[PDB]
Amino acid sequence: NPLVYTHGGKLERKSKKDKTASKVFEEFGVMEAYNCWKEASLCIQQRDKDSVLKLVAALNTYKDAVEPIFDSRLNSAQEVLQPSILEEFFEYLFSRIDSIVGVNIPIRHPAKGYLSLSFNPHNIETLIQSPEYTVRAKDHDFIIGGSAKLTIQGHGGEGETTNIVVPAVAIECKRYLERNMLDECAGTAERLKRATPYCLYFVVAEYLKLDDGAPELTEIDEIYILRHQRNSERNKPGFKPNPIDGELIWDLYQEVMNHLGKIWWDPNSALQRGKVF
Amino acid sequence: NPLVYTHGGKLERKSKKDKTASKVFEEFGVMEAYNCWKEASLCIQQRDKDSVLKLVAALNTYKDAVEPIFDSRLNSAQEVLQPSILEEFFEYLFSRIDSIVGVNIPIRHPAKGYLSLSFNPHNIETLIQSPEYTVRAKDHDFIIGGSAKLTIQGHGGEGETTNIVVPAVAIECKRYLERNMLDECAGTAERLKRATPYCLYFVVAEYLKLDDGAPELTEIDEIYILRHQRNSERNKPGFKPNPIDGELIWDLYQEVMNHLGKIWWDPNSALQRGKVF
Amino acid sequence: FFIYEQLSHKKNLEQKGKNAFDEETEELVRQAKSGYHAFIEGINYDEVTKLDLNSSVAALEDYISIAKEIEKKHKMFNWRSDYAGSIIPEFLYRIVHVATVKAGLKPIFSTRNTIIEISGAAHREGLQIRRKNEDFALGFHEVDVKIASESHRVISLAVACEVKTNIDKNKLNGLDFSAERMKRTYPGSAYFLITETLDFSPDENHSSGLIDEIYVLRKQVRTKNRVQKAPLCPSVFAELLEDILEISYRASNVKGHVY
Amino acid sequence: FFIYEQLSHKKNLEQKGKNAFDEETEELVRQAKSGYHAFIEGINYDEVTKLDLNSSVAALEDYISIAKEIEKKHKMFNWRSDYAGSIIPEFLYRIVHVATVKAGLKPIFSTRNTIIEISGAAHREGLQIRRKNEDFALGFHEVDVKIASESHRVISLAVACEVKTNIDKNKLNGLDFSAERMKRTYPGSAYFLITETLDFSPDENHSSGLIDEIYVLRKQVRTKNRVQKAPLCPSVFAELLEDILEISYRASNVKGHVY
């Protein structure tokens, strides 16, 4: 049961490197709001429906305090520390699964989810002696999974070892999602399902900025719209930004846990059942 | 410099299991024709243009003697031993490359050319402890390449090792090619180029049985039509079956050797050159 | 159109045959099918419970057992993937609940360009638009297409299936190839493969990617059991056919395009 | 159509601007381009030797060096991937040798179905047919398409390219995504990516599959060199632009459909 602290680390990084930001952080109480949020999140230790809603409330409080400062008073923040808020939130929510799942999960944070291996030999002698190979992986905002160590030895016997991460759930977190970002995901999804067919893949957005006509839902498991609002509303008459929806975080928590709770690949279970996944 | 003897082994297999065939082999001198061909092929030791043509002549002689017996006197022969003739012929032609290439190639015969690796975890504990993975490979009629040993260890430290073959040239050999078999190849080609992008892929046919309108040549490197004849000619007035064309075998021999003779993957050679392959 | 691919096959075999026709009448084939067809007809929509799906499967085996023996006796030749190999690619061909439409058992695969000349390209450029004959297709709906005044009539599919007696490794590879093409044309579409018995020649496990499910109707470990003339006899199990509601569920889902 | 995407951009900037227009006249921009455009015009078809390709590149750098400085001074804002990022997506836009035709710098990506209602599906079903705006496209040729009396004007492409100043890892991934779609629509087609300088942020090597070539016009190891205000200055090397005959060769090959 550990935490990586994605957002907090980046707040720590920024306060040494960017003295504009460092000054603004302390001046407007970014640090205090964060510490409140961090410790308030660590306080909720059971995982019934109600408990999760309490966790969501802590997230909403933090964003209300901190995001208006980022938007109006900093340049290098929108895609530098803002998106890591959701990333760290999910670190908290899933920090207590080892007990439930009944084994030590090493990966519950952003990491690179394995997609494929392919062989690119420099020359003929190379191919035969020990060929160079390449591992493609996608950066994901939040991965639950295990690590392994891939290895190739050629005719010349000296090994090539790469540290890879084979995911159970991969989650993308955006402030608002538009179609060129969805299409990024749509292409990931194909590749990720091929790498780990029983990997679950979610897209987590607060706002939707999608192109009218029917979006393909194809191959992405679920797409979350946590604030139930269109992005065009943000500048419209009588706008009030909705809170991140605790029922959908709860849905996600349940679907994850259900995914973790099942039997995934089983040749004999295919027979008797019929169906693979 | 070894040989696997694809066809000869299958002739040996058949003469113990199928007493109809065993009787027919000895009765009609299949064994003798083969031994003539085997030893006559081993005799041609230089690899200039002329030498290759001599090799091709030996192949044509053998097929002239043996294939009429197979067609008229045996049932379990057309897709049981006939296609292995071309397979063994290429074993001979390439049996003398170790000297030229300047290192020991382990694979110069039919084998399974690596396509992809993917992770299929039985459950969550499994994924974390040591996940089961799967290697897809395509049977190819003739592969020149090296072998390697792929390895995965999980949290529980105990290793999973699979023997894989990463190809330089993969060759398909058919008596006559029709479109559903080409489409089989067209799909292999995509996958094989992805596994080994500097793998060369040829389709070797004697006759063409293709569907009029423009075939896609896309992604298969070269397609060989060794007898320069349509399959519909085989039953037509004044038909004489053409010999396998030594100029095309020569083309193949040169293109292979050129492929083997080059530099394949090089990051610094990309810069200065511009182009990857 | 009321497509019974198999009964249309009977219409055709009886009409062209004569010897096959005398065989049908004496072997009670049309009757045997009618007995089977009527027992399923008893199973209606209200009766599409778990109990009804099993009752239908029982009747199916009665028929298929009698069908097989006529082909597998001394009567005689053209009886392969023609007759028996088209009994299971029909079943609950028509639903009731959603029942949007469909567009038949074939689907438009894709298109390529193949013009002779520069002048011909301006006049009307040659294309080659594919459509394979799959065992059974259920579609969402609907079109035709025109390309330079060349019109071709479009099927857009929700589900596709082949039905085979047994699956080996090398066939499974080619089946994988078919599915890649399918998914390219129609993103959302499910592809199923349905077989009775399984013959995985290498024990090596099989290609997950792009095949959206494979189903074993017999749940039978190996085909060889059945092939080997012996005590070993398979069973068409109703529970296996019951869990092919995945198709129905998916089809229904696409009708309701909302939030 | 004589498409200069960049000169049309000049036509548009001068027309809408006024302040930008006074800047063009004083900065000698149209003139500077005309000087450049005329020097290339000296390089004809007989002059498409190795020597001529280099002479053209020398003139190109003269112009692009002068173009950059006007945007990169105090004049002023909307001057990004508008003006500067459309000088290299033209060049040898017209050949001579084969010169079949083309079909512009955009290509029809693919199609999906999106109907509101069952009645609407029968009436005329809604589709969504894609077409991205790529930097430069050369096509084989030619069509339009109609779907239920909905007509859309078809480009079938031989080559496609983007031109960028610099390539990072995450952009390369999305560029890979674009190419998958492209290859699905048009099997044979080559996709190139062309950039001046390379910024591989992780040293980890890059995605071979579906990108048919990437070219570095500067052969410059890192962008940071140029970005870092310092002695370090790149060079647009003619030899790099010379080896983009791969495109011409491929296009020509498809014209002659024989044995």
Numbering used by the authors:
A (entry chain C), B (entry chain D): 6 to 282
C (entry chain A), D (entry chain B): 6 to 264
Task: Please give the exact wording used by the authors of the publication that reports this structure.
BbvCI, a Type IIT restriction endonuclease, recognizes and cleaves the seven base pair sequence 5′-CCTCAGC-3′, generating 3-base, 5′-overhangs. BbvCI is composed of two protein subunits, each containing one catalytic site. Either site can be inactivated by mutation resulting in enzyme variants that nick DNA in a strand-specific manner. Earlier mutagenesis of these residues confirmed their catalytic nature and demonstrated that the site in the R1 subunit cleaves the bottom strand of the target site, while the site in the R2 subunit cleaves the top strand.
Subsequently, crystals of the BbvCI enzyme were grown at near-neutral pH. The crystals corresponded to space group P32, with four subunits (i.e. a single enzymatic tetramer) in the asymmetric unit. The crystals diffracted to only 3.8 Å resolution; nevertheless, they produced an obvious molecular replacement solution using the previously determined structure of the R2 homodimer as a search model. In the resulting hetero-tetramer, the two R2 subunits occupy the same positions and orientations as they do in the R2 homodimer. The pronounced concave surface present between the two R2 subunits is also present between the two R1 subunits. These surfaces pack against one another at a ∼45° angle in the tetramer, forming an X-shaped dimer of dimers. In the hetero-tetramer, two deep grooves are present on opposite sides of the molecule, each formed by residues from one R1 subunit, and one R2 subunit. Within each groove, the catalytic site residues of one subunit are exposed on one side, and those of the other subunit are exposed diagonally across on the other side. These paired sites occur ∼25 Å apart in opposing orientations, appropriately positioned to cleave double stranded DNA to produce a 3-base, 5′-overhang. Out of the entire calculated buried interfacial surface area and corresponding free energy of association for the tetramer (5094 Å2; –37 kcal/mol), a substantial contribution is made by the R2–R2 interface (1838 Å2; –32 kcal/mol), whereas all other interfaces in the tetramer contribute ∼600–900 Å2 that are predicted to add a few extra kcal/mol of association energy.
